[PDB]
mmCIF file of C-alpha atoms in Angstrom:
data_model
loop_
_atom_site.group_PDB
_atom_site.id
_atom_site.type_symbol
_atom_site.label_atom_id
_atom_site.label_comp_id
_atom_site.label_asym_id
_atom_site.label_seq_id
_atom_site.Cartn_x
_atom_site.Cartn_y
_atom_site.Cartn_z
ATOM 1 C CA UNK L 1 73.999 95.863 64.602
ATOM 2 C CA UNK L 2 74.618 98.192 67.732
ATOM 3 C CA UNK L 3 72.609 100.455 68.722
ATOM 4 C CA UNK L 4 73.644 103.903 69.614
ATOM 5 C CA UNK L 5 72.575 106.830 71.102
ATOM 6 C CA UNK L 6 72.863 110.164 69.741
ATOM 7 C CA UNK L 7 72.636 113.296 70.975
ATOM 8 C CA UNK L 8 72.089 116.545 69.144
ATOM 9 C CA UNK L 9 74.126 120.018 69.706
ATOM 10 C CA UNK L 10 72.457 123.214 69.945
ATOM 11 C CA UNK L 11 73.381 125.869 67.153
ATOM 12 C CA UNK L 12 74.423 126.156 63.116
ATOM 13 C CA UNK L 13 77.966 124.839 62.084
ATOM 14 C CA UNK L 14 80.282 125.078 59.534
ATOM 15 C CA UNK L 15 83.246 123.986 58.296
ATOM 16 C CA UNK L 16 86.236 126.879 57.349
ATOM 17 C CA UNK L 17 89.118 126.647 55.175
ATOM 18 C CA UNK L 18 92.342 128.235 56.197
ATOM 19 C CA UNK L 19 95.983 128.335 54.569
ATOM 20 C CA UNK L 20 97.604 124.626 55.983
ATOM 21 C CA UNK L 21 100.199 127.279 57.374
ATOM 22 C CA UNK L 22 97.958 129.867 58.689
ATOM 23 C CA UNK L 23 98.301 130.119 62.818
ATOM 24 C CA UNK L 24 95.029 129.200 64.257
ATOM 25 C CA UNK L 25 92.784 131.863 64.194
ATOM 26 C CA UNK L 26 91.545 133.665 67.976
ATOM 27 C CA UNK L 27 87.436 132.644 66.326
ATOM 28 C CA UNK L 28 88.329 129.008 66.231
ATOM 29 C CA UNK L 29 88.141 127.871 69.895
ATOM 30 C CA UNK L 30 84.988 129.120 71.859
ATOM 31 C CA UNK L 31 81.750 127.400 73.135
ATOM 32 C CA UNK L 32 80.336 123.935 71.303
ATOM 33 C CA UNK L 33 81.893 121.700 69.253
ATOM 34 C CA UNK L 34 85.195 122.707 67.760
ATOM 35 C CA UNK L 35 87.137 120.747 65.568
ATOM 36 C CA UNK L 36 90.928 122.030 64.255
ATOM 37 C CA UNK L 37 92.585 119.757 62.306
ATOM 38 C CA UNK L 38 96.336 120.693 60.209
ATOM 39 C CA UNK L 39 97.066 118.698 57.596
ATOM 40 C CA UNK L 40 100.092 118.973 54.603
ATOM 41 C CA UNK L 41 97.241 120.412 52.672
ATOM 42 C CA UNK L 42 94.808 122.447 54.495
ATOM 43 C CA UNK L 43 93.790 124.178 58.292
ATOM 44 C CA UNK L 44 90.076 122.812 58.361
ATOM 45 C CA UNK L 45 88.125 124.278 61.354
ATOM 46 C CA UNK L 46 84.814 123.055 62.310
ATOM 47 C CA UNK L 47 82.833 125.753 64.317
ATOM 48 C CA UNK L 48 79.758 127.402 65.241
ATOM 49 C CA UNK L 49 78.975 129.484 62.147
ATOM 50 C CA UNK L 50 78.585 132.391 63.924
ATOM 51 C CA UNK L 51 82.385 133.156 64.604
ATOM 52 C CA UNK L 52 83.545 132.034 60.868
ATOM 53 C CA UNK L 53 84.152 135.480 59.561
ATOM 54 C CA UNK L 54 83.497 136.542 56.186
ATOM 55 C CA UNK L 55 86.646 136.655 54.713
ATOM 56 C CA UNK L 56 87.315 132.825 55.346
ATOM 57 C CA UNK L 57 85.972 129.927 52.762
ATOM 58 C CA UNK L 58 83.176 127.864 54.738
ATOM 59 C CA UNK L 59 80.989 125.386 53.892
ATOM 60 C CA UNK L 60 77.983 126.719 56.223
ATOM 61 C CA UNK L 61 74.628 124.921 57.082
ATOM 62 C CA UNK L 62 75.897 121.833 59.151
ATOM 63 C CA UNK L 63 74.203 120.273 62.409
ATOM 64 C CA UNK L 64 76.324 118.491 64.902
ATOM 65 C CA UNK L 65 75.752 114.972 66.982
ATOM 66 C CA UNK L 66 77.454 113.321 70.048
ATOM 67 C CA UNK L 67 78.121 109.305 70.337
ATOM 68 C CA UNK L 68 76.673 109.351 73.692
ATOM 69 C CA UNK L 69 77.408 107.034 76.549
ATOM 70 C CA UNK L 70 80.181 104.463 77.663
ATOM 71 C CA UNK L 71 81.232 102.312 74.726
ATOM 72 C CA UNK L 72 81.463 98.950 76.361
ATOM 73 C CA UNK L 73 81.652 97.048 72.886
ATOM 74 C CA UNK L 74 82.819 93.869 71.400
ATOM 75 C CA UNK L 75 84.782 94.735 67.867
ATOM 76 C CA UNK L 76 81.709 96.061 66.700
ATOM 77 C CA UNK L 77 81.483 99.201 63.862
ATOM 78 C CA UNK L 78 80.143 101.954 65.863
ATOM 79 C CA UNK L 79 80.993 104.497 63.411
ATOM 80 C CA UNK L 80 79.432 102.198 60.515
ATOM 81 C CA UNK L 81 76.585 101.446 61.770
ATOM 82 C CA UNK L 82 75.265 105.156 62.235
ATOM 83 C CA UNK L 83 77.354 106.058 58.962
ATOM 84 C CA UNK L 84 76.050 102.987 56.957
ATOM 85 C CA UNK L 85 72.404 104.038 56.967
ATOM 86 C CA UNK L 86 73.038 107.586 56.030
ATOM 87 C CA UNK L 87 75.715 107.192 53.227
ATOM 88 C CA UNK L 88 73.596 104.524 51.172
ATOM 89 C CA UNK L 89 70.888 106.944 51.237
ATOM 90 C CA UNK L 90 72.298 109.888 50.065
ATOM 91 C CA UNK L 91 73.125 111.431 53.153
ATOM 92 C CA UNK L 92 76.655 113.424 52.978
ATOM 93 C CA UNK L 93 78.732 112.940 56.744
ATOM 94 C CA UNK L 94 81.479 114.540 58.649
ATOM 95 C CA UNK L 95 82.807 112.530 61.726
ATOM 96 C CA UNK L 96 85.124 113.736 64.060
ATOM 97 C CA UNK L 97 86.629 110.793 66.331
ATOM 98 C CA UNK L 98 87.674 111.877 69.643
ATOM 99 C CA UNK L 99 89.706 110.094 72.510
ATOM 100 C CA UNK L 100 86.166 109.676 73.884
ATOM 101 C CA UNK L 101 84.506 108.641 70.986
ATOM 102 C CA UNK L 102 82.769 110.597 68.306
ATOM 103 C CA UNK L 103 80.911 113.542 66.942
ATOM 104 C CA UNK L 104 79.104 113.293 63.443
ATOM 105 C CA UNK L 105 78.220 116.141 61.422
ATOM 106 C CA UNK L 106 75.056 115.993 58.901
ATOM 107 C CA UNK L 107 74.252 119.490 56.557
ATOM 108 C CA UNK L 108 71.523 120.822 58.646
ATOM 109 C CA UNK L 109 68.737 120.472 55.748
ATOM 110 C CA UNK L 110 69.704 116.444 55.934
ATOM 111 C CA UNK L 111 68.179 117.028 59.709
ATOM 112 C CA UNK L 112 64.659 115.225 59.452
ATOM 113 C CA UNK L 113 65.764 112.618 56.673
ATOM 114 C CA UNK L 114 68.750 111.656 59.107
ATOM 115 C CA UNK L 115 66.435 110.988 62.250
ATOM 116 C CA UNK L 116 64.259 109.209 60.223
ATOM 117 C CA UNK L 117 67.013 107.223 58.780
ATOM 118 C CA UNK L 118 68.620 106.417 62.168
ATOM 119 C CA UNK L 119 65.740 105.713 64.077
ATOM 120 C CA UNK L 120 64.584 103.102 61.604
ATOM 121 C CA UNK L 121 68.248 101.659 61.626
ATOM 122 C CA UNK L 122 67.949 101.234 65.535
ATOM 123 C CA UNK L 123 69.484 103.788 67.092
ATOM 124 C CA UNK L 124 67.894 106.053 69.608
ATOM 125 C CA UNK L 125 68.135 110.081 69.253
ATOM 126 C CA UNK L 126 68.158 112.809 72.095
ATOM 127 C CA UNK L 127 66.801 115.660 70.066
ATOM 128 C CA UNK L 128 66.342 118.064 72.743
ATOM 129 C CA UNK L 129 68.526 121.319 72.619
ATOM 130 C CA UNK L 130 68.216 125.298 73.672
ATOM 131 C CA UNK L 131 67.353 126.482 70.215
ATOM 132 C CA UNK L 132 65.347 129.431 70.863
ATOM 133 C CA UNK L 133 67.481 132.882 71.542
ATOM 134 C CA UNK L 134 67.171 134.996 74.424
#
């Protein structure tokens, strides 16, 4: 199974849901990880929490992770084998494949239980992050 590296984002995120005809909305792009997908059904935005106003559904409380590093790999499940270990264990994901790889998304109470989880699966976690405000 590969091994990956993950990396963990600073900061609460959530995941709004706008009209699938709604323009996008001037609080979706800003600072960390922002995800705006359209589809025929929905405008699902993927934010820090803090700019999702009130008047928007959300489902609040998630913590984000990078895919870290070059991928040099050979037909191997990258996204299975960090999803695999969660999912059989009751762990609910998000992932959010980029051109560069991907991002995975894990409610942020599922924190500990995921670490735990992925480290005994094999993969190696960069938990460090400026949590503390100013």
């Amino acid at each position: 199974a590969p091994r990956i590296k993950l990396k963990i984002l600073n900061g609460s995120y959530g995941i709004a849901r706008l009209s699938a005809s709604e323009a996008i909305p001037a609080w979706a792009d800003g600072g960390g990880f922002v995800s705006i997908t359209r589809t025929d059904d929905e405008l699902s935005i993927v934010c820090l929490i803090d700019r999702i106003p009130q008047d928007v559904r959300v489902d609040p409380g998630w913590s984000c992770f990078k895919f870290q590093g070059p991928f040099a790999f050979d037909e191997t499940g990258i996204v299975l084998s960090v999803i695999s270990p969660l999912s059989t264990n009751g762990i609910g994901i998000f992932v959010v494949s980029t051109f560069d790889g991907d991002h995975l998304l894990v409610r942020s109470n599922d924190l500990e239980k995921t670490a735990d989880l992925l480290a005994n699966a094999g993969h190696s976690l960069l938990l460090e992050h400026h949590h503390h405000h100013h």
